[PDB]
Amino acid sequence: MFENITAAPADPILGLADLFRADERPGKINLGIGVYKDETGKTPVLTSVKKAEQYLLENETTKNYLGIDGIPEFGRCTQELLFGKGSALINDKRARTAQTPGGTGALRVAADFLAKNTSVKRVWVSNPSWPNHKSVFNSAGLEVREYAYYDAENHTLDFDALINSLNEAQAGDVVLFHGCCHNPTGIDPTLEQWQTLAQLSVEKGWLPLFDFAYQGFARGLEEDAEGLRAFAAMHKELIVASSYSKNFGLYNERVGACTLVAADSETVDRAFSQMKAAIRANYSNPPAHGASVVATILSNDALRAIWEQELTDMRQRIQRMRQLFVNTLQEKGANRDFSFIIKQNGMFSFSGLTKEQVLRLREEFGVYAVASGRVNVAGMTPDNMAPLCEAIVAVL
Amino acid sequence: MFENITAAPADPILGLADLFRADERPGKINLGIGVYKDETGKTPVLTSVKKAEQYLLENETTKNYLGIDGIPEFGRCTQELLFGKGSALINDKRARTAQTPGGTGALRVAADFLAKNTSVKRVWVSNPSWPNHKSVFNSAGLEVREYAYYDAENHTLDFDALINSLNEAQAGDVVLFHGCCHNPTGIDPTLEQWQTLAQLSVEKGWLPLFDFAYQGFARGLEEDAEGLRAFAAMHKELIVASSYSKNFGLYNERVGACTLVAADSETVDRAFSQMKAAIRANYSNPPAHGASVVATILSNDALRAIWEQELTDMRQRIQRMRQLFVNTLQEKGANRDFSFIIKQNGMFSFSGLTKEQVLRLREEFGVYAVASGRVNVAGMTPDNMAPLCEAIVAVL
Numbered sequence: 001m002f003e004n005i006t007a008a009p010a011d012p013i014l015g016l017a018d019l020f021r022a023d024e025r026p027g028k029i030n031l032g033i034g035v036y037k038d039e040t041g042k043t044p045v046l047t048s049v050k051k052a053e054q055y056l057l058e059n060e061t062t063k064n065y066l067g068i069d070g071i072p073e074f075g076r077c078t079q080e081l082l083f084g085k086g087s088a089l090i091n092d093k094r095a096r097t098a099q100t101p102g103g104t105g106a107l108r109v110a111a112d113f114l115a116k117n118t119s120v121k122r123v124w125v126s127n128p129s130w131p132n133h134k135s136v137f138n139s140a141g142l143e144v145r146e147y148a149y150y151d152a153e154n155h156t157l158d159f160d161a162l163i164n165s166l167n168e169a170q171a172g173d174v175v176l177f178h179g180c181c182h183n184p185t186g187i188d189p190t191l192e193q194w195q196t197l198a199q200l201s202v203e204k205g206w207l208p209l210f211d212f213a214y215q216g217f218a219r220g221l222e223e224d225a226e227g228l229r230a231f232a233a234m235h236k237e238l239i240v241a242s243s244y245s246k247n248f249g250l251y252n253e254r255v256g257a258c259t260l261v262a263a264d265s266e267t268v269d270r271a272f273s274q275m276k277a278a279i280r281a282n283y284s285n286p287p288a289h290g291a292s293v294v295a296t297i298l299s300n301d302a303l304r305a306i307w308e309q310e311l312t313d314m315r316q317r318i319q320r321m322r323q324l325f326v327n328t329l330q331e332k333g334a335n336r337d338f339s340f341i342i343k344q345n346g347m348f349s350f351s352g353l354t355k356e357q358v359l360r361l362r363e364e365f366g367v368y369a370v371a372s373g374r375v376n377v378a379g380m381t382p383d384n385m386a387p388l389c390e391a392i393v394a395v396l
Numbered sequence: 397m398f399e400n401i402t403a404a405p406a407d408p409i410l411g412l413a414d415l416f417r418a419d420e421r422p423g424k425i426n427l428g429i430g431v432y433k434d435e436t437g438k439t440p441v442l443t444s445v446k447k448a449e450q451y452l453l454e455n456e457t458t459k460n461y462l463g464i465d466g467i468p469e470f471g472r473c474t475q476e477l478l479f480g481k482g483s484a485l486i487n488d489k490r491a492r493t494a495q496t497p498g499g500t501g502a503l504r505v506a507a508d509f510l511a512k513n514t515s516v517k518r519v520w521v522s523n524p525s526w527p528n529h530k531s532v533f534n535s536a537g538l539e540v541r542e543y544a545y546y547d548a549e550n551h552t553l554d555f556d557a558l559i560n561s562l563n564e565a566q567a568g569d570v571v572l573f574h575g576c577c578h579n580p581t582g583i584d585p586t587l588e589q590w591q592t593l594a595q596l597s598v599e600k601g602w603l604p605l606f607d608f609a610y611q612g613f614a615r616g617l618e619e620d621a622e623g624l625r626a627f628a629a630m631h632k633e634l635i636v637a638s639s640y641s642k643n644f645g646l647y648n649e650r651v652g653a654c655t656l657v658a659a660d661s662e663t664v665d666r667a668f669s670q671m672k673a674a675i676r677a678n679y680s681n682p683p684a685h686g687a688s689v690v691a692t693i694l695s696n697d698a699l700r701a702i703w704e705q706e707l708t709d710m711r712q713r714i715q716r717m718r719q720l721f722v723n724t725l726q727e728k729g730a731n732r733d734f735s736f737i738i739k740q741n742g743m744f745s746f747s748g749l750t751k752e753q754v755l756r757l758r759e760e761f762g763v764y765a766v767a768s769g770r771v772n773v774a775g776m777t778p779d780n781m782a783p784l785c786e787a788i789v790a791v792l
C-alpha cells in the first residue's frame with residue numbers, strides 16, 4: 001500500500017532545524033525558525049509562566065476533558081486582547097472564540113470551517129508570506145492566489161501594487177492579512193493604510209482572515225491591534241487566527257485561538273456550532289496546559305504585570321539587535337546598504353540575500369537562514385554578531 | 397457570508413455534557429462520556445502524573461518547539477507498549493510514531509495521510525462503533541462502510557456475520573478494528589478470532605487500522621495488545637491510532653500516537669515524511685505537556701510501578717461496579733436479565749435500553765446515558781447505584 005509513496009520535500013522552515021542539529025560545525029549559528037533567544041542564546045521559560053505553572057500544579061484537581069471550544073476565560077481574555085476591553089463586538093456578543101492547538105491549528109480550523117460551510121473557493125495570501133499558509137489552505141481544499149505586497153528594491157510596502165492585484169479578488173473571496181509583524185517582510189501597513197484596506201474590503205465584499213501571531217512584538221499589545229480594530233469597526237464578519245506561541249514563549253504547548261465574528265449573536269452562534277463540529281472531527285478538544293497558563297496570567301493582575309514586562313523586554317532587545325546588526329555589517333565591510341533593516345518590525349528581517357548566498361552561508365559558514373533570505377534577528381546576540389556579520393560579508 | 401449557515405446537530409456524546417451541566421436537579425447522574433470516576437465520584441489527577449508534573453516544573457528550561465512528530469522517547473515508549481519489548485517491528489526499524497493531540501488527532505492524521513498519499517477510498521467501521529469515527533474519516537474525504545459485529549439478541553460477537561459482511565471489502569480497502577474494549581459493545585474477539593481475522597485480512601488485501609484507546613482496561617497492558625500483535629506478525633503494513641487519555645487520566649492534555657508500519661525502514665521512512673507533511677498543515681507540531689508526562693512516567697521505573705498500580709485499581713473498580721450493577725438491578729426487581737453486562741469489558745455497557753427509555757431516564761430522573769443505550773460503568777458509584785437502578789427499573 002505504501003510502496004509507491006514518494007518522500008516529501010522538507011519544510012523550508014522546520015527542516016532547517018533538522019540540518020542544524022545534525023551539523024557538527026562548532027561555531028554554527030541558527031537564524032531560521034522564529035524563536036526568541038536571549039543574550040545567552042537560550043529560549044527560556046518566562047517567569048510569569050513558571051509561576052502560573054506552579055499554581056496549576058497545586059490547584060488542579062482533574063484532567064477531565066475541556067469543551068470543544070476549550071476554556072471560557074481563555075476565550076474571554078483573547079477577545080479583550082484582540083478587540084479592546086469595552087469593545088462593541090464583545091458587548092453585542094458577536095464573537096465566539098475556540099481555543100486551538102497553536103495559531104496553525106486556528107488557521108486550519110478556519111479553513112475546514114470555511115470550506116465546509118461557506119461558498120468560499122479561494123483565499124488570497126500576500127507575496128511573500130509564511131510558506132505554511134499555502135499548505136493549510138490547500139489542505140482544506142481551498143485555492144490560494146497571491147497579492148502583491150513587498151517592493152524588493154525599495155524595501156517597502158507597495159500599496160499601489162497591493163491594491164491593483166487585489167482588484168482580481170471576487171466578492172466572497174477570503175483575504176488573509178497579517179495583524180502586525182509581516183512574516184517575512186516585517187513591513188506593516190500604516191493605520192491610514194489599514195483604514196483604506198478596511199473600506200475597500202467592505203466595498204468589494206471580501207471576508208477578512210487575520211493571522212495574528214506576533215501581538216506585542218511591533219509596538220505594543222494595543223498598538224499592534226489597531227489595523228484589526230479598524231477592520232472590526234466596519235466589518236460585519238471577520239475571522240481571527242491568533243497565537244500565544246511567541247508572546248508567551250509557549251511554543252510547544254500549542255496555544256492559539258480562532259475567533260469568529262458575525263453580524264449578530266444568533267448568527268455567530270449558529271455558525272460557531274459548525275466550527276465546533278469541524279474541531280470535533282479533527283482533534284476533538286484542546287490541550288489544557290498552555291491555555292490554562294495564559295488564562296491564569298491574563299486574569300491575575302500581578303502575574304499579568306510581570307508578563308507584560310517580560311514581553312516588553314523581548315521586544316526591545318530584538319530592536320537592539322536590529323541596530324547592532326546593521327552597524328556591525330556596516331563596519332565590517334558591507335558592500336550594500338542594509339539600513340532598511342532598521343525599519344522592519346518583529347523577529348525577522350528580509351536581508352535581500354539571494355538563494356545561493358543563503359546556501360553558501362550555511363555550507364561554508366555554518367550560518368542558518370531561510371532560503372528566502374529571512375533572518376531571525378531575535379536569534380542574534382552580541383556574542384554571535386561578529387562571526388555572523390563576517391560570514392554575510394564574505395558572501396556579498 | 398454566514399447568514400445561511402445551518403446549525404450543527406449536537407454531539408451525541410460531547411453534547412450530553414452540556415445538557416448535564418445545565419439542569420439544576422439535585423441528584424442527577426452522568427453516565428455519558430467515557431471518563432473514569434472514583435468511589436467519591438471524581439476524576440482525579442493520577443498520583444504518578446502529579447509527580448511527573450512536578451519534575452517537569454523543576455526541570456524544564458524551555459518551551460521551544462518540538463519536532464513535527466513530537467518527543468522521541470515518547471514514540472519509543474509507545475512502540476514497546478504496542479508491540480512489546482524486542483519486537484521485530486522495532487528491531488527492523490519498521491515503525492515510525494508521531495505524537496498527536498489525542499486518539500482523535502491520530503485517527504485524523506491517519507485519514508489525511510491515507511487520503512492524500514494512497515489510493516484508499518473507503519474505510520470499514522463496525523456497527524455499532526464510536527460515532528466520531530464516521531465524522532473523522534468523512535472529513536478527510538473517505539467513504540465509510542459498515543461491517544456487522546454485535547449480536548444484540550444474544551449479546552455476543554456475531555463472528556460469521558462479521559466475516560460475511562467484510563467479504564464485501566476490496567483489496568486496498570481500509571478496515572478499522574478496536575484494539576480492546578470495543579466501544580460501545582465491550583465485546584472483543586478472542587485471540588483465535590483475532591488470528592482468523594489476521595489471516596483473512598492478509599489474503600483479502602485489507603489495510604488494518606487499529607484504534608487503541610483503552611490499553612490496560614480489559615485484562616492488562618500486555619494482554620490487551622494480543623490481537624494487535626497477531627496482526628503485526630502477519631502484516632507488512634498497518635496503522636495504529638492510540639490514546640493515552642484514559643489509561644493516564646490525561647483527558648484534557650490530548651495525548652496519543654499515530655504509528656505507521658511498512659514492509660521495511662526505507663519504505664516506512666518515505667511514507668512517514670508524508671505523514672509529517674500532513675501534521676504540519678494541520679496543527680504544525682504537538683503539545684508537549686501531556687506527552688512529556690507519559691514519557692517521564694514510562695521512562696522511570698519507580699513512577700512506572702506506581703502508574704501501573706493506579707491503572708489496575710481503575711480497572712478493578714470498574715469490574716466491581718459491573719457486578720454491583722447487575723445485582724442491584726436484580727434486587728430492584730428488573731424485568732429482564734442483565735447478566736451479559738458482566739461479560740463486557742472496558743468503561744461501558746451496552747444496556748439494551750431503547751431510545752425512548754434513555755430519553756425518559758433523563759427527563760424524568762436526571763440519569764444521563766448516550767442515546768444508543770451505552771452506559772458509563774466507570775461513573776457508577778456505591779452511592780449512586782441505588783437511585784440509578786431504581787430509575788432504570790422504572791422505565792422498563
Ligand SMILES: Cc1ncc(COP(=O)(O)O)c(CN[C@@H](CC(=O)O)C(=O)O)c1O
Binds near residue numbers: 014101
Ligand atoms: C505568520 C505566522 N502564522 C502562524 C504561525 C504558526 O504559529 P503557531 O506556532 O502558534 O502555530 C507562525 C509561526 N511561524 C514561525 C514558526 C513556524 O513556521 O513554525 C516561523 O518561523 O515563521 C507564523 O509566523
Ligand SMILES: Cc1ncc(COP(=O)(O)O)c(CN[C@@H](CC(=O)O)C(=O)O)c1O
Binds near residue numbers: 283284526579652
Ligand atoms: C474508541 C475510541 N476511540 C478514540 C477515542 C478518542 O480519544 P481521545 O479523547 O484520546 O481523543 C475515544 C474516546 N471516546 C470517549 C470520549 C469521546 O467520545 O470524546 C467516549 O465517550 O466514547 C474512543 O472511545
